[PDB]
């Protein structure tokens, strides 16, 4: 099914973290990533700006894109970011990989899922 | 393994009775045959509707919504005219495929969060109101003023 070996590794790591540190978000994200690419999140910034609050990490089971404006200072964790998205986010906040999210927060506390 | 790869041995390759998969009778005639009779379902109905004006008397407007302009002012500041806590932008310079169009028109979708002075050939009423209510102004190009007559 999946041909990207890094996507598979990501998914395997998300499961290991959910089964141990009890973060149910990571399991939820793993299952969505296992679903067809078609269903994966593609989120622009306007959507993150609208639903995010500070000191709550935004989690995108998918990829973050660059339309819209992000003022809020937030940590956004995603499978990938467009070049523009990562640049706009790093100005007011922090763009981070899901692999880092799992490291800093294996229990998946204080996160909000956004698609 | 593909579906197709599994057909050998099946004899009918998914076609049902071997009496199927013959000529065009199996499809109700060639192409759109029957679109008015046995196959009428889900075809547009028959007939003639309306008229067309000659391709050469048609004008093509290049359009942009204020939202696109406004969301981008900071990045356009690295390029077009920041002045007055305010921004001045000639819209013809912003819009892709402007020169290939008869005129440039600013439309009114979304919000204006800055004070903007906008130059274009034409404006929707809503684009004018939003740009003014944000404490900005709308500047009709010479060509824009010609359009009044």
């Amino acid at each position: 099914s999946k041909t990207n070996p890094r996507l598979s590794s990501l998914i395997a790591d998300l499961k290991s973290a959910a089964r141990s540190s009890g973060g149910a978000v990571w399991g939820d994200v793993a299952e969505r990533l296992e679903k067809p690419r078609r269903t994966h999140a593609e989120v622009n910034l306007g959507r993150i700006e609208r639903y995010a609050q500070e000191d709550e990490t935004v989690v995108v089971p998918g990829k973050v894109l660059g339309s819209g404006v992000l003022q809020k200072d937030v940590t956004v964790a995603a499978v990938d970011f467009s070049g523009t998205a990562e640049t706009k986010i790093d100005q007011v906040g922090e763009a981070v990989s899901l692999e880092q999210a799992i490291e800093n927060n294996p229990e998946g506390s204080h996160v909000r899922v956004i698609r | 393994t593909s579906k197709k790869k599994r057909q050998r041995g099946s004899r009918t390759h998914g076609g049902g009775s071997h009496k199927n998969r013959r000529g065009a009778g199996h499809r109700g005639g060639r192409g759109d045959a029957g679109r008015d009779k046995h196959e009428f379902h889900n075809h547009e109905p028959l007939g003639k509707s309306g008229f067309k004006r000659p391709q050469k008397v048609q004008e093509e407007a290049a359009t942009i919504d204020v939202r696109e302009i406004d969301e981008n002012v900071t990045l356009l500041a690295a390029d077009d005219v920041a002045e007055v806590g305010g921004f001045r932008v000639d819209v013809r310079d912003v819009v892709e495929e402007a020169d290939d169009a008869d005129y440039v028109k600013v439309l009114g979708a979304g919000q204006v969060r800055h004070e903007l002075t906008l130059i274009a050939d034409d404006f929707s009423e809503g684009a004018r109101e939003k740009v003014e209510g944000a404490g900005g102004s709308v500047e009709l190009t010479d060509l824009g003023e010609e359009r009044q007559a």
Binding site: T3, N4, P5, R6 | -
Partner: protein, 246 residues
């Protein structure tokens, strides 16, 4: 990271920054895809004669002779695919598109990714290359480009502990099957890719299994023959730098 530059005696002389692309995450899927495309794109169109089996006014007698209704000419069956000498029902055709498209970005990514795989000594040994050293790729003085004799390159490679790969590639397989009837009798392992700057290395080119390339045009097949990443490579110092922006 840092790369250790070597001179023509094989002795460490100075060192340089290993450029950022050698940190490109290794994607064997993307690399395989770029290679499959380049391989497809040099294949030649072919097909049977469009009229083969059709040149005959053979006609069926129809019922009444106690015979199947099959076109015959002079009492022999003709033209139909179940007939000996009859046409091929669904033959190869020249008009078929045998090329594979690939997005420039996607291809460019695979180039960078294959570059990075050459910097990983475990990957390179996994691929099957034979050599003894911790550091890969091998970077070398630009004077390598002035070498002329093949034996000089041998000595240098021996001095760099890298010559055993040439030994691996020095043997040919006489292939099973009918390719030999088409000129495809032989094959051999791939050994060392030599990447220079000005022109490819005539001195190294005839070494067993060797390929020569240049930093500006070096491709995924060069870096990853058969789509397998981690080829044992030597870069010239200038090549190493030029490859940085690819």
């Amino acid at each position: 990271m840092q790369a250790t530059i070597y001179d023509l005696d094989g002795n460490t002389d100075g060192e340089v920054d290993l450029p950022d692309v050698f940190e490109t995450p290794v994607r064997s899927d993307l690399i395989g895809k770029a290679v499959r495309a380049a391989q497809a794109n040099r294949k030649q169109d072919y097909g049977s004669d469009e009229y083969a089996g059709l040149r005959t006014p053979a006609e069926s007698f129809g019922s009444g002779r106690g015979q199947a209704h099959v076109p015959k000419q002079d009492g022999r069956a003709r033209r139909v695919p179940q007939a000996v000498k009859g046409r091929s029902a669904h033959p190869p055709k020249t008009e078929k598109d045998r090329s594979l498209d690939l997005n420039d970005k996607e291809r460019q990514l695979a180039v960078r990714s294959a570059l990075a795989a050459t910097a990983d000594a475990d990957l390179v040994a996994d691929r099957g290359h034979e050599f003894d050293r911790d550091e890969v790729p091998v970077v070398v003085s630009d004077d390598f480009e002035d070498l002329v004799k093949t034996q000089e390159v041998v000595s240098l490679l021996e001095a760099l502990d890298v010559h055993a790969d040439i030994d691996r590639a020095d043997e040919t397989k006489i292939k099973a099957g009918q390719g030999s009837a088409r000129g495809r009798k032989y094959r051999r392992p791939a050994s060392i890719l030599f990447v220079t700057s000005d022109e490819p290395s005539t001195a190294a080119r005839n070494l067993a299994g060797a390929d020569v390339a240049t930093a500006s045009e070096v491709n995924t097949e060069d870096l990853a023959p058969g789509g397998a990443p981690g080829r044992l490579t030597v870069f010239t110092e200038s090549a190493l730098a030029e490859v940085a922006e690819r």
